[PDB]
Structure formats: structure tokens, C-alpha cells
Amino acid sequence: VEDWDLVQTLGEGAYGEVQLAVNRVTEEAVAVKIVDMKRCPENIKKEICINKMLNHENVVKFYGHRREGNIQYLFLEYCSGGELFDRIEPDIGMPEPDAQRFFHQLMAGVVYLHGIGITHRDIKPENLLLDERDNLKISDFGLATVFRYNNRERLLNKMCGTLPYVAPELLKRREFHAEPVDVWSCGIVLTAMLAGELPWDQPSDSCQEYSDWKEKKTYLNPWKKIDSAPLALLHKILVENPSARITIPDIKKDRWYNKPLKKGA
């Protein structure tokens, strides 16, 4: 209902909804995110602001914004593939070559964000969308924030994200570096893809499955489905001390990361 028709509902969250809009003249599809500022104005001005900085093949395109009352309309690349979440078979995951390719595309997007001083802070399969040729795009910058400006880093203090995906320092420390948190969440997503389950409700000393992983009990049941070469990478991502945790440039040199698995189109 805005130059375009609102054909179907795409992702009814908390803020409002994402709809698939079609232009009735040109037949062009986009996603429109609809937020009723009455039902925050502060984070939404941050979201659109972050979104205008963004330009990359593995980040959901931003086309523009109108205010039409209280109602903000973020116009956004439509991804006809839907959520990575729906390509993960529960208890099974997906073929390893598919997982690896999605993991390459996720790191490409994350390297790009971090390079422009942005952290997403909520990486999980619900927030990773697939375009028409199954290319992965990072979606939803509503929790995103700047962690580097004029080349100076600032530590984060606000706890946010989604508990099974969150790194342990964010539960333990008053301030923490933004990039190791995104890396950790990337390793939970890789686990979800290769085992089709999440390893723990949250990375707490009070959580048994998490305790089991630190004791390297990899005979148990996320890890036993995985396979020694991706598992070795996960041993380097899911390291409790954020300073010993592997970084992205070092992820790109990992053996499974560079292992040939998958054919072309």
C-alpha cells in the first residue's frame, strides 16, 4: 500500500512486521519492514543509519526509508530463499558442502561489517537469508552497533543477542570486545548447520552441556555428528577466553575452511 502492494506477511516479529511488497507497474518485489514508532524511535534511527552505511553482496540491501506518520517503512532486498533456519533439518543439519559454502558467505559478510566498524550482535540462522541463487545475506541491523570509529575501538557493555548464540564473556564481563562475540555466534551457527541442534541453552558454568564441552567430551551429541575437520575449527571458535579465540583472518586459513567439497552451479 505504498506505490507497491503488500501481498504477503514475511516475518511478524515484535517491532512490527516484514511484508513482501510488489510494484504493480514493474512487478518488482521487495521486503518492507513496518515499524509503528508508537507500539521505539531511538534504535530505529540507528537501524536505518547503520543500514545506509551498508553495501555488500552478503548483507541484505537497503533501498530507502519513508516516515508516513508514526509508521517507518524500511525498504529491503527481498530474499526469495527464506531463512537459513529452514534448510537445517532438526537433528541432522545439512550436507557438509552446503554448510561450508554458507559459512564462507557468512564470514565474507562478517569481515565486511567488521571492516567498517559495525557489529551485528545477533547472528543466528533466523537472521541469515537466502537470495534466489541461495546466496547468504546477513539481515536485521536492529541490534547492530558501531564498535570502531575514527580507528579507535570501543568495548561494548550492553548485553544483547540470543542466549544459545551469545559468547560467555558477554554473560561474565562488564565490557568486552565486539569482534570475538560475532565470531563465537558464527561457530554456533556452524554447529547448528552440521548437527541440526544447538549445543547449550547458554554458555554458563551453570549449564551442563557447556561444562561438557570445556571438558572436551566430544563423544556426546552435538559434536559426535560433526566430523573431525569442521570440529577442529569449532574447537578454535568456541574457546571461552575471547583473547585466545581464533580470529577471522585465522579462520580463513583453517584446514576444513579451505577443504574442497562442492561443485559449481
Ligand X SMILES: NC(=O)CSc1nc2ncnc(N)c2[nH]1
Point out the annotated binding site for ATP. 10-18, 33
When asked if residue 64 is in the footprint of ligand X (CB under 6 A), the reply is no
In a 10 Å sphere around its CB, with 0-12 CB exposed, 13-18 middle and 19+ buried, how is residue 105 labelled? buried
Which of 70-78, 88-96, 154-162, 176-184 is the region at the interface with ligand X (rule: CB under 6 A)? 70-78
Residue with nearest beta carbon to ligand X: 11
Say if CB 100 and CB 261 are below 8 A apart.
Answer: yes
Residues 6 or more apart whose CB falls under 8 angstroms from that of 235 comprise: none
When asked if residue 130 is in the footprint of ligand X (CB under 6 A), the reply is no
When asked if residue 143 is in the footprint of ligand X (CB under 6 A), the reply is no
Say if CB 134 and CB 81 are below 8 A apart.
Answer: yes
Q: Which of 59, 76, 88, 237 binds ligand X (CB under 6 A)?
A: 76
Q: Which of 122, 140, 169, 212 binds ligand X (CB under 6 A)?
A: 140
When asked if residue 18 is in the footprint of ligand X (CB under 6 A), the reply is yes
Q: What single letter denotes the amino acid at residue 234?
A: L
Closer to ligand X by Cβ: residue 13 or 64: 13
Q: Which of 41, 64, 82, 115 binds ligand X (CB under 6 A)?
A: 82
Closer to ligand X by Cβ: residue 3 or 153: 3
Q: Where in 41-60 is the site for ligand X (CB under 6 A)? A: 60
CA distance to 82, 110, 113, 178, per residue, from 239 (Å): 31, 19, 22, 15
Residues 6 or more apart whose CB falls under 8 angstroms from that of 45 comprise: none
SS3 259: coil
Q: Between vectors from CA 29 to CA 61 and to CA 45, what angle results, nearest 5°? A: 40
- The gap from C-alpha 125 to its chain's centroid, in whole angstroms, comes to 6
Residues designated as active site: 122
Within 26-108, strands assigned E span 29-36, 62-66, 71-76, 82-83
The annotation places the binding site at 10-18, 33
Q: Tell me how far, at minimum, the Cβ of 150 lies from ligand X, in Å.
A: 30
* Bridge partners for 149 per DSSP: 152
Q: Tell me how far, at minimum, the Cβ of 53 lies from ligand X, in Å.
A: 18
SS3 131: coil
Q: Where in 223-262 is the site for ligand X (CB under 6 A)? A: none
When asked if residue 129 is in the footprint of ligand X (CB under 6 A), the reply is yes
HEC per residue, 185-237: HHHHHHHHHHHCCCCCCCCCCCCHHHHHHHCCCCCCCCHHHCCHHHHHHHHHH
Q: Which of 4, 73, 78, 223 binds ligand X (CB under 6 A)?
A: 78
Which of 78-86, 160-168, 175-183, 248-256 is the region at the interface with ligand X (rule: CB under 6 A)? 78-86
Which of 75-83, 143-151, 163-171, 181-189 is the region at the interface with ligand X (rule: CB under 6 A)? 75-83
Closer to ligand X by Cβ: residue 100 or 139: 139
Kindly list the residues in this chain that would bind ligand X in the complex (CB under 6 A): 10-11, 13, 18, 31, 60, 76-79, 82, 129, 139-140
